[PDB]
Amino acid sequence: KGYVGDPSDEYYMVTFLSGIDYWKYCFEGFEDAAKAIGVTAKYTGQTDTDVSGQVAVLEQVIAQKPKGIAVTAVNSTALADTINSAIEQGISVVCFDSDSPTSNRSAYLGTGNYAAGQKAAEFLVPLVNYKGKIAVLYTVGAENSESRVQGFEDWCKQNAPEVSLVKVNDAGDTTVAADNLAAALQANDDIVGVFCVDGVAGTAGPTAVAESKKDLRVLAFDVDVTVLDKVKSGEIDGTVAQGMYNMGYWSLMMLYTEANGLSSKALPGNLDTGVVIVTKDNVDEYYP
């Protein structure tokens, strides 16, 4: 038995908010991984963010007895126990997008958030010519947001010494975010750029900049249709797209390799699927 697989070996991509466009980019790689090893790729998940619901839908995925599940967990600790029972009954499970690291999953395939911040700084800082202040709008307390800010700030400290940052909390709310960004622009007249780290920031960010009536360089995150339209119209300069296709593509490679055993050692633990800066040159490639 090599990589020529059987369409009878079922492999699930278990998600939350199954209907949103984000998972379409991921499953397109998951169902492209299965386009050559030729195994069965199914796409299921809970339609909402409910933790109780996600535990229930993966128990039914486990009930269908698959050789391997690529699952993104709603929480870092909620799917802890339900995924261990799966492994105890001969199921190979990796995690993509959102990881359950305290679990016994074999590998994680997702964005290196610290590295993602460095790449975002590699693009935004030259736009402001390596000088001035850059406002960073992020959710204080969110692990990935803090890692993106740290990578951003660290890149600036090593490569753009004349650049300083002002940290602005969005508090996971668009109304509070736009207010905090408005006050930041009022107190700091040397602000030349705005990095929107999360979704909430990608919404209240441009609004507080437009009301400011200041011409600043804005970089958002992810590929929401609202953000993509701002990139095409020229309201913002770009957005950071996660390697969603890579998350689905390489998840089945590790899952199948573990399912049968075509590698003598355990799989690599972490794959950084990277980020791509979406500008006017490539924004058409990311529209749903």
Numbering used by the authors: 32 to 319
From the primary publication:
Similar to the typical SBP fold, all of the Cbps adopted two-domain structures connected by three hinge regions, with the buried ligand-binding site between the two domains. The crystal structures of both unliganded and glucose-liganded CbpA were determined to 2.10 and 1.85 Å resolution, respectively. According to the “Venus-flytrap” mechanism, i.e., ligand binding causes a dramatic conformational change of two-domain SBPs from an open to a closed state. Hence, the structure of unliganded CbpA assumes an open conformation, while CbpA in complex with glucose adopts a closed-conformation, resulting in approximately 37° rigid-body rotation with respect to the unliganded CbpA structure. Furthermore, the binding pocket of CbpA is distinctly small for the accommodation of a monosaccharide, and no additional space appears available for the binding of larger cellodextrins in CbpA, thus explaining the functional specificity of transporter A. The ITC experiments showed that among all of the tested substrates, only CbpA binds to glucose, with a dissociation constant (KD) of 240 μM. In agreement with the ITC data, NMR titrations showed that CbpA binds glucose but not cellobiose or cellotriose.
